[PDB]
Every structure is written in C-alpha cells, then in structure tokens.
Structure 1
C-alpha cells in the first residue's frame, strides 16, 4: 500500500517509518544507492529533485513533513480538533527547526561546530519539556490524549540527540519518561530493536 523511496539511511525517513510500524501498517522500502542517484533520472523525476518520495495508492508525495502530515491525517494521528491540530503542527515545526540545525551540524561542520551545538542543546530541548509539562503533567502525550504524528518525529529527534550528546535528556524528567514510554509501545519497540533500524546509519556521511 505504502512505498518509501530513500537512500540507505534513517535520516528524514526514521520518523515516518516509526509511525508506520507503531500503527501496524505495511510498506515497501525502495532503496536508492548513490550510483543510482548520480545517474540523474530518478532525481530529475522528483518534484524538488530530492528524496524521500512516498507512494500511497496512486498518490505520490515528496517532502518528509508532507508525508508525516498525510499519514497523521489519514490515520487519525492529528489531535481531536482544530485547536489540538494547531498544537501538533507547532510541535512538528519546532522539531523540524532543530532537525535542520542538527543536519547543518552533521553535514557542514561537525568538527568545528559540535562544541557550540552541544552547549546550546539544553535550551533547544527545553521547549518540548515545557510543552509536556502543560498537558496532563507530561504523563501521556505532548498534545491531547492520543499519539500524534509529530511525536514520532520528536522521538527520533530525541533519540539521535542522545547519540550526539549522551545524557542530554537527563535534566529533563518529562522528556526522559516520555522517551521510555513511547519506546515501549510494542510495535515501535520491536521496530527500534530490529536490524532494519539498528543497522542503518543515522546520516549519510557516517557522522552522528
């Protein structure tokens, strides 16, 4: 039903894969190698000349957040109403902003910029702890009473930052319990422990 077209890395497809798995969905992975990409035809056929590319029936989508939002809308992972939907987007956009800063670090100046990035991290993670504290004491989800698509994206972002800076969640009790809680959902837990996830590099330049 679903097909994910992407390079052999977790990157911008980790969240959407976690979402599919946790939700019991089935999908096909169409892996694109660098040689295949450098050939030029696939790229030229992509709307924005980039991956991921996603297929749902005969609907083809581009843009990782468009895919996440589409799955959130069709599978009911977008809040109970417009008010919560706006809050879900606010969380996702906040995640996207930090993922971009992370990507810039990883691909453009890991070596010289890592120390400054790590020092600024607490202040970049805190907004999510505050959001959790404002909804049911942070005991359940970040928005409302049900999981939303933005949470798979936030979970991946937290997971890759713990790799980048072990212990970065330690001073954030709500985020820490949230990560353990989400990571324990049965289907998500199996997915996170599987080779499909574990043996795929986080990024394409071997940095993390």
Structure 2
C-alpha cells in the first residue's frame, strides 16, 4: 500500500485521516505502537516532535495529524475548487482542531471535574459548524463547496466523538444531524465505520469518552 499510519491502538488523532483514506478507496498499512514500545523511548526520540501519528507516503515521512490531512487533501483533490475555497476549508479545519483540543484536554486532564462545564458549553462550540452548513447550499452538500474535503472527515469525527461524550448534542442542529447521517452513509465510509478495525478501538488512550 502506498501509505503507512503509525499510531497507538486508538482512534484519536488518526480517526479522521483513516475515514478519509477508507472513503477515498485508498489502501494503507497500520503500524501499531504499544505503550510498552513507546515507553521504551527509541521510536519517540526519532519522531520530529516526539509524538505520533507518523505517516509515510512512499519516500515521504510526515508528522502532525493536520499536516497529514492537508497532504492527503492536496494530493487527492479534497481541498475545495480554488484558493478561495481552500481558505474556507482551512478555516473549518482550524475550528475543528480548536474544539478537538478542548476535547482532548477534558478527556486526559480534567474529565471528572470538568465534564459538566464542558457539556454546558458544547452547544455554543458546535453552532459555528451548523451556521457554516446553513450558508453552503442549505447544508445539503459538504462543509465547504460541493465536493468533500479533508475538513469534512475531521468535522465528522469531531461530531461522532461528541455524540458519545454528550448524547443528543446534535439534536438542536438539524443540518449537522443530517450531515452526519449523509456522510456516514457513503458506502465505503459506512463499511469502514461498521468494521471492527474502527469499532473495536477505543476513542482515546485512557479509556475515557
């Protein structure tokens, strides 16, 4: 396969790029890194920023989950139709990463005491994505433009993991709700999301969700 994904046995920051690859019919190899192997230190020391994911595209080695998403976006034509739409794609993805950031901070550093405040704040954090859908073909296509982009895969994962954290959190948002259903029904993606490759990995590395 042209691609290799190197990561812990978790969905985490590789979930969206895996959905992208599956949906696009691309083949890849998973190199699973155990925490025992990670704690040994040598792989970590070799990583540019001492972190995973690490990704290989033939001779090219990449780090940074959003670098991997933008690279796949660029090379597979999942980055909008022109420079103006590419900027809108980036603006969506940077917004997804900000909330993913907040989610990861809750999960790994403050889950027991901070979940109440997080869930209370969540509608205000999701509403921008509903507003963006409402301004693009009535929400009937994708988050930017009329073709899928890497930002759609990242937003879709963000929405899925938030439905597990806070069940019902999309019920006030009809366009986000319909978008989750529509993209989740794309045949290759539907098959991936139902497969044990996806279903039998935990969302996060500490067993919280």
Which of the five TM-score ranges fits, normalised by the shorter chain? Answer: over 0.9
**Structure 1 residue ranges (4+ consecutive) displaced by more than 6 angstroms after TM superposition:** none
**Deviation of 1:194 (Å):** 0.2
Tell me how far apart the structure 1 counterparts of residues 89 and 193 of structure 2 sit (CA, whole Å).
Answer: 23
**Deviation of 1:59 (Å):** 0.1
**Deviation of 1:102 (Å):** 0.1
**Deviations, residues 23-76 of structure 1 (Å, cap 9, x unaligned):** 000000000001100111100000000000000001000000000000000000
Give RMSD over aligned pairs.
0.3
**Deviation of 1:104 (Å):** 0.2
TM-score (norm 2): 0.99
**Deviations, residues 165-205 of structure 1 (Å, cap 9, x unaligned):** 00000000000000000000000000000000000000000
**Deviation of 1:136 (Å):** 0.3
Tell me how far apart the structure 2 counterparts of residues 35 and 201 of structure 1 sit (CA, whole Å).
Answer: 17
TM-score (norm 1): 1.00
Tell me how far apart the structure 2 counterparts of residues 167 and 38 of structure 1 sit (CA, whole Å).
Answer: 38
Counterpart in 2 of 1:85? 86
Q: Partner of 1:60: helix, strand, or coil?
A: strand
**Deviation of 1:149 (Å):** 0.4
Equivalent residue runs for 1:161-180 within 5 Å? 161-180=162-181
Tell me how far apart the structure 1 counterparts of residues 143 and 203 of structure 2 sit (CA, whole Å).
Answer: 24
Q: Partner of 2:169: helix, strand, or coil?
A: coil
Instruction: Find out whether 1:202 has 2:198 as its counterpart.
Output: no
Tell me how far apart the structure 1 counterparts of residues 36 and 173 of structure 2 sit (CA, whole Å).
Answer: 43
Gaps of 5+ in 1: none
**Deviation of 1:94 (Å):** 0.1
Tell me how far apart the structure 2 counterparts of residues 29 and 90 of structure 1 sit (CA, whole Å).
Answer: 29
Gaps of 5+ in 2: none
Tell me how far apart the structure 2 counterparts of residues 25 and 18 of structure 1 sit (CA, whole Å).
Answer: 10
Instruction: State the number of aligned residues.
Output: 208
